C-alpha cells in the first residue's frame, strides 16, 4: 500500500544548479540500439550462415525452422515434420544429431566468443 501512495515527480523540474539542465535530460533510453552489438549481431548472423553450410541441406533447414531463423517464428516438431513430411519424432531425432554436429570442436569453437 505504501508503494501505491507515492506520487510521481516532474521531469520538467530543474535538478541541475541554476537551470543548467532539467531532470528529464539525465534519463537513459535503455531501449536505444547499441552500435557495437548491432555489428556483432550482424557478424554472428554471418558466422552462423557458414556453420549452416556445413550441415545437410535438409538438416540446416530443420535448424532454421526449429528456432525460426528464417521466418522469425519457431515451429514445433510436428510443424517441422509437416513441411518435411515425416513424423514429429523423426524431426526430434534429426535435431538432436544436428546439435551433436554443432557441438563438434571444428564447428563450435568459433562461436564461443559470442556468449
Amino acid at each position: 500500500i505504501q508503494q501505491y501512495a507515492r506520487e510521481p515527480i516532474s521531469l520538467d523540474q530543474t535538478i541541475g544548479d541554476e537551470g543548467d539542465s532539467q531532470l528529464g535530460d539525465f534519463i537513459e533510453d535503455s531501449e536505444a540500439v547499441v552500435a557495437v552489438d548491432a555489428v556483432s549481431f550482424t557478424l554472428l548472423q554471418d558466422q552462423l550462415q557458414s556453420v549452416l553450410e556445413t550441415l545437410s541441406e535438409r538438416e540446416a533447414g530443420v535448424v532454421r525452422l526449429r528456432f525460426g531463423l528464417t521466418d522469425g517464428q519457431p515451429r514445433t516438431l510436428d510443424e517441422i515434420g509437416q513441411v518435411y513430411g515425416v513424423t514429429r519424432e523423426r524431426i526430434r531425432q534429426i535435431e538432436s544429431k544436428t546439435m551433436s554436429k554443432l557441438r563438434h570442436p571444428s564447428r563450435s569453437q568459433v562461436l564461443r566468443d559470442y556468449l
Binding site: 508503494q3 516532474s10 521531469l11 520538467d12 523540474q13 534519463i27 566468443d113
Partner: protein, 195 residues
C-alpha cells in the same frame, strides 16, 4: 495596422476559423514520457497534467450538457475548459500559471519550445556530441605548432572503434568482441596499435 492581419488571410488560403479549435492535438507520449526513476520513484512531464486538466474539464462538460444543467454551470465549464487549453499551450500568458506541488509553474508547450536552455535557442542549436573529451591543460614547450599532447587514456577511448579494427586486422584479436575487451582492459598490446 489591422489591415495587415486582414490582408494576410486574403492573400493566403488560411481560413480564419483556425484561430478557434474544435479539436486539440495530443503530443506523442515519448516527448511527454512517464518513466520510473532510479530508486523506485516515478517521473513524468507536466504536459500529462495539463492534458489531464483539459480532458477532465472537457468530459465534465459533456456530462453537464447531457444533464441539461443551467447555463451558469455549463458556461462556467466552458470558461474552465478555455483556460485549460490556454494553460496547455502557453501557461501563465494569462492569469496566474497552473502550478503543481511546491507552487512551481507547469511547463506548457510554449516553454518547452523556447528558452535559453530550451529546445528553441540552444538545446536545438547546441547539443552534445560523441567522440569527444576534455581535461586540464598544461604547457607543452617542446611541441611543434601543429602538435598537441593527448593523454594516452583519452586518445584510447576516443579512437576506440579505430584501434578495435586495427588490432583485429592484425591477428591480435580474432573478432570485434575480442577487440573490445582488449581495449577496455587496456592490455599493453594496443598502445603500439594506437600510435
Amino acid at each position: 495596422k489591422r489591415l495587415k492581419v486582414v490582408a494576410a488571410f486574403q492573400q493566403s488560403g488560411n481560413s480564419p476559423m483556425g484561430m478557434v479549435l474544435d479539436a486539440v492535438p495530443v503530443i506523442p507520449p515519448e516527448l511527454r514520457p512517464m518513466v520510473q526513476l532510479d530508486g523506485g520513484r516515478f517521473a513524468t512531464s507536466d504536459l500529462n497534467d495539463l492534458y489531464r486538466r483539459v480532458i477532465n474539464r472537457n468530459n465534465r462538460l459533456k456530462r453537464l450538457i447531457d444533464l441539461g444543467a443551467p447555463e451558469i454551470i455549463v458556461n462556467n465549464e466552458k470558461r474552465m475548459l478555455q483556460e485549460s487549453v490556454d494553460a496547455l499551450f502557453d501557461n501563465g500568458r494569462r492569469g496566474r500559471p497552473v502550478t503543481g506541488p511546491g507552487n512551481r509553474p507547469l511547463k506548457s508547450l510554449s516553454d518547452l519550445l523556447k528558452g535559453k536552455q530550451g529546445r528553441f535557442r540552444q538545446n536545438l542549436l547546441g547539443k552534445r556530441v560523441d567522440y569527444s573529451g576534455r581535461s586540464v591543460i598544461v604547457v607543452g614547450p617542446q611541441l611543434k605548432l601543429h602538435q598537441c599532447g593527448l593523454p594516452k587514456l583519452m586518445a584510447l577511448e576516443l579512437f576506440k572503434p579505430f584501434v578495435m579494427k586495427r588490432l583485429v586486422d592484425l591477428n591480435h584479436a580474432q573478432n570485434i568482441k575480442s577487440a573490445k575487451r582488449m581495449v577496455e582492459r587496456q592490455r599493453p598490446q594496443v598502445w603500439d596499435v594506437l600510435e
